[PDB]
């Protein structure tokens, strides 16, 4: 009742599996009408079936956050059938490609965030929640990319929060640690063992434990939290 | 056998400095979520006021006198709670110790962390036995408007973060989480008193354009205490309306 | 022996972008003072000429060149020209709804120049890349937002590039100035300066020279184990 | 019996010598980092008082100073004791002058370790501040601990000590800045000491894998940074912690 999102529309990107899907189900559990997105029509349909199977109202759709056209078209569709999303959740490697990876990720956050801000500004209320990437990839390049993406996400989140706060729109981030998903489940055992050894709690996190934090941030009780990045990592801090 | 999101039914919670403001709002929020709540104060009148507040809101628990600077007060208070209510598995540290100068920070931080440590170590034994716990440390609000106020606030906040992260690392294998909540400018007795032009300027450093309510702090505490926050540990959650000063 | 171990820059070529005034010019003179051959750059021919005159007047060998760090072509052409006529720069100092584009542009420029100069440093197995942050630009909320964002981007970028190139004995550091005495701060009403000074423990503005001295240290052999760091030069005034 | 005060015994004018005979107090100067710091400040022209907790350490410091042509002394000092600190500083003031450069390098486990270390930094810092305030000039430089051990306990202690040092340094800087006294810290990473020199090669290889520069730092590389912070060119640097870790960042 206190935690309720009844009457809200929520847009969760990348909702067809793992953390995105858990987030979609948690906001649904709390009463939101949920629009979950995937990059394929089959993913969108899977989202709609998942939603239905858990008794959550809303829809799956196709969204490419790298495209201005996909973003404008998708928001127009949502406004036409439902209304304005006021909760929006944005959800080896090489040694040298950290720069393009971060740059792309932040350009996508920015693109979607700016597009949804018009509606939140009209409503004088909003929640933007950015989900960082999960710990996992191998060696020095993986560590470099993780730390860079996390620093980008924190600084971006703080700045956007300063820019939009006078409108009663909060902007926060959740930075996960080593979370049990399809992408971490079949990491080489030795890499997994070593990651577990760096975690005080001595276990992987669950997607649901990320989603609970997102659901708190989306609620009215988190209205004075903004510009924050909440680490959800079992005490494993990697800079 | 119940199993609900956010529920603290069956838990005993100890909230230090619970007679007013943030501490009292925290005590009521944990009560709202089903905890048996023990709130503490350094005086018998503060303890009575806590008992009355709890009773008036239909929260089971007690108000007790506790001096966190004293090993004897800490052992006595825990023994009493164990006898009459059970082991506190949720512990919220909100107790801390003319105009303010920038030379007070050392003794203030030193005293506060020594007390956090004393209480935390005492309650860990029960949590270790239960293989479950929540320790939540509340930071101090911005105490004055100028440079001295910033210095003292930034020092206390840096101490609290580092302490919190370290203790979390020390106790995590036992499924005990240790987190902190760092308020910014909260509507309390301090803010209520200052000049109107000075208020306006204060609000101008806060992106949300308003003071925080004690209740907004308490809601964050209540989340951290829940099962859903089980993989959050070592964290400091800023609750400051976007006003970041270090 | 204890008393003779070079912390001078004789025999090095240094490239200092945005060298026509203020901080960039002081950095160019300090590296010159320490013995480097200095190429300072500006975006205009007039700025380049001013740099050449300033260098000549202080007895520093090098040149003033035109360089636009936002352009791949200007960057490749200018380095090729430097390699032909002076040698490979092994010390490179980057000094040249709004916050997002500003940070994005700045980091794209740092990345472009850094990658271009890394080839020569890799060949020499030695280098110094030093990024200069922006001074506190403006007084209000927008200024704070822009300043903190640019600083956070600079720090993360700096740390990541340092990790990428460290095995080659190339260090990558940043210097983050606070309030510095420049054309910006000179124009403030006399009283508004007093209020600004009240937030700075040291009670004064920094000098361009004080930024330059820190750069000159980072460039030296004694700073060889410092990488990935951002050195705040702000008189104790910290804002994030 | 034990003598606690040992002078170094010490016409070339070295280009390096800019600290002009100013007096520098370097605690924990008998070996490793402390000793390199003492030599570097000597190289830059300071009169250097290095301290150790034993008379034999103090004598070793005096010999090291003498052998490098540095003017100053080795003294006994216990930074955990108010009495040792007051007595030693009074002695220095009488016999050598007010130290205007002070380098603090002498320092369930993490809490008591950090607490003790900060209390020592505070005690010494407060004691030397009167002389700096009179001179309207000073440098206080705090040296963090090296990465002490390989596992979780080592990481907890290291991160806690570092976070305490940074927050303390910034707060003290704010407190003493209006007097033109700077307060900074240097946070080392993995440094080549007697301890690290003798680890099994497979353990050393794995350690080096976490350091982008691919090597241990030298004590001298810490000292150089301290020396820069002590100079007039670092006058607008205060409240800062300079990491010196080859790109290895642990929190
Ligand atoms: C673990 C991590 C940090 C700290 C600690 N202690 C302090 N402090 C202690 N006593 N006086 C000041 C601090 C004072 C100012 C700023 C940060 C501080 N941090 C202690 C344990
Ligand atoms: C590695 C580490 C960090 C960043 C990065 N990029 C940004 N950013 C990028 N593009 N536009 C803004 C940032 C914007 C605001 C605050 C911090 C930022 N950090 C990039 C690489």
Residues of chain A that touch chain D, judged by Cβ-Cβ distance less than 8 Å: 140, 147, 197-198, 200, 237-239
d(CA A1, CA A69): 38
Domain residue limits, chain D: 1-251
- Smallest CA–CA distance, residue C100 to chain B, in Å, is 17
Three-state DSSP class for C68? coil
Beta pairing class for A126-131 and A33-38: unpaired
- DSSP annotation of D198: G
| Binary contact (B223, A221; C-beta < 8 A) | yes
Which helix (H) or strand (E) element contains residue D52? strand D47-52
Pocket-testing residue among B107, B112, B162, B165, ligand 1, by greatest number of atoms within 8 A of Cβ = B162
Quote the CATH superfamily of domain C1-240.
Answer: NAD(P)-binding Rossmann-like Domain (3.40.50.720)
Supply φ then ψ for residue A79, to 5 degrees: -65, -40
The answer to whether C169 is a known ligand-binding residue is: no
* Backbone phi and psi for residue B91, each to the nearest 5 degrees, phi listed first: -130, 120
A202–B239 CB contact, under 8 Å: no
What residues flank ligand 1, with Cβ below 6 Å? B 106, 109-110, 113, 155, 158-159, 162-163, 166; D 114-115, 118, 160, 163-164, 167-168, 171
For this structure, is C238 an active site residue? no
Residue C160 is inside which H or E element, if any? helix C141-165
Query: C201 to chain B: nearest residue by CA?
Result: B147
* Alpha helices, H only, B37-85: 44-56, 71-84
Ligand index nearest the alpha carbon of residue C158:
2
> Is position C58 annotated in a ligand binding site?
no
Which residues does chain A have within 8 Å of residue B212's beta carbon, measured at their own beta carbons? 224
- Residue A131's DSSP bridge partners are A174
| Calpha distance B159→B37 (Å, rounded) | 27
Nearest to D46 by CA among D203, D181, D229, D242: D229
Which one-letter DSSP state was computed for residue D74? E
Question: Is the separation of the CB atoms in A207 and A21 below 8 Å?
Answer: yes
The shortest C-alpha distance from C184 to chain D (Å) reads 18
Cβ contacts of A215 on chain B, cutoff 8 Å: 228
Reference B21, options B150, B140, B127, B109; nearest CA is B140
Cα separation of B16 and B40, whole Å? 5
HEC secondary structure over chain A: CCCCCCCCEEEECCCCCHHHHHHHHHHHHCCCEEEEEECCHHHHHHHHHHHHHCCCCEEEEECCCCCHHHHHHHHHHHHHHCCCCCEEEECCCCCCCHHHHHHHHHHHHHHHHHHHHHHHHHHCCEEEEEECCCCCCCHHHHHHHHHHHHHHHHHHHHHHHHHHHHHCEEEEEEEECCECCCCCCCCCHHHHHHHHHCCCCCCCECHHHHHHHHHHHHCHHHCCCCCCEEEECCCCCCC
Nearest listed ligand to the Cα of residue D172: 1
Task: Decide if domain A1-239 falls under CATH 3.40.50.720.
Answer: yes
Q: Which residues pair with D217 in a beta bridge?
A: D191
How much of chain B is in helix, strand and coil states, percent to nearest 5? 50, 15, 35
Q: What is the dihedral of CA D68, D71, D75, D78, to 10 degrees?
A: -90
Contact assessment for residue A161 and residue A129, using Cβ atoms and an 8 Å cutoff: no
CB contact under 8 A, D237 and C229: no
* Resolution for this PDB entry, in angstroms: 2.0
To the nearest 10 degrees (0 to 180), the angle between helices D32-43 and D219-230 is 50
Strand order through the sheet with A87-90:
A58-62, A33-38, A9-12, A87-90, A126-131, A169-176, A229-232
CA dist D56 and A103 (Å) reads 58
CATH number for the region D1-251 comes to: 3.40.50.720
- H or E segment and range at residue C158: helix C141-165
CATH code linked to domain B1-246: 3.40.50.720
**Nearest ligand, measured from the Cα of D122:** 1
What letters, b where the CB count within 10 A reaches 16 and e where it falls short, cover C29-58? bbbbbbbbbbbbbbbeeebbebbeebbeee
Q: What technique determined this structure?
A: X-ray
* Best residue among C107, C149, C154, C160 to mutate for probing ligand 2, ranked by most atoms within 8 Å of CB: C107
Phi, psi (5° rounding) for residue A66? Answer: -80, -5
CA atoms of A124 and A126, how far apart (whole Å): 7
DSSP D159-197: HHHHHHHHHHHHHHHHHHGGGTEEEEEEEE-SB--TTGG
Q: In what order do the strands lie in the sheet with B12-15?
A: B61-65, B36-41, B12-15, B90-93, B133-138, B176-183, B236-239
Q: Could you tell me the distance, in angstroms and rounded to a whole number, from the CA of residue C100 to the centre of ligand 2?
A: 8
Backbone angles phi, psi at D72, to 5 degrees: 150, -145
Exposure string over D74-85, b if 16+ CB within 10 A, otherwise e: bbbbbbbeeebb
Q: Which residues contact B169 (CB under 8 A, 6 or more apart)?
A: A200, A235, B234, D152, D155, D156, D159
- Tally Cβ neighbours within 10 Å of residue D108: 8
Does C152 contact A140 at a Cβ distance shorter than 8 Å?
A: no
Tokens representing residue C85 in the block: 């006529």
Classify B179 as helix, strand or coil. Answer: strand
């Amino acid at each position: 009742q206190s935690m309720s999102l009844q009457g809200k529309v929520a847009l969760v990107t990348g909702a067809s599996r793992g953390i995105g899907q858990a987030i979609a189900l948690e906001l649904g559990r709390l009463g939101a009408v949920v629009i979950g997105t995937a990059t394929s029509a089959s993913g969108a349909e899977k989202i709609a079936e998942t939603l239905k199977a858990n008794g959550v109202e809303g829809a799956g759709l196709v969204l490419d956050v790298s495209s201005d056209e996909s973003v404008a078209a998708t928001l127009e569709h949502i406004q036409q059938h439902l209304g304005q999303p006021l909760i929006v959740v944005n959800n080896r490697m090489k040694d040298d490609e950290w720069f393009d990876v971060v740059n792309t990720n932040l350009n996508s956050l920015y693109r979607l965030s700016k597009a949804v801000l018009r509606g939140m500004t009209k409503a004088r209320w909003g929640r933007i929640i950015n989900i960082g990437s999960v710990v996992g990839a191998m060696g020095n390049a993986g560590q470099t990319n993780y730390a860079a993406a996390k620093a980008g996400l924190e600084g971006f989140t703080r700045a956007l929060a300063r820019e939009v706060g006078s409108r009663a729109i909060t902007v926060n981030a959740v930075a996960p640690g080593f979370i049990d998903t399809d992408m971490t489940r079949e990491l080489p055992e030795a890499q997994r063992e070593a990651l577990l050894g760096q975690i005080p709690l001595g276990r992987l996190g669950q997607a649901e434990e990320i989603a609970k934090v997102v659901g708190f941030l989306a609620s009215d009780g988190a209205a004075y939290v903004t510009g924050a990045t909440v680490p959800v990592n079992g005490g494993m801090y990697m800079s």
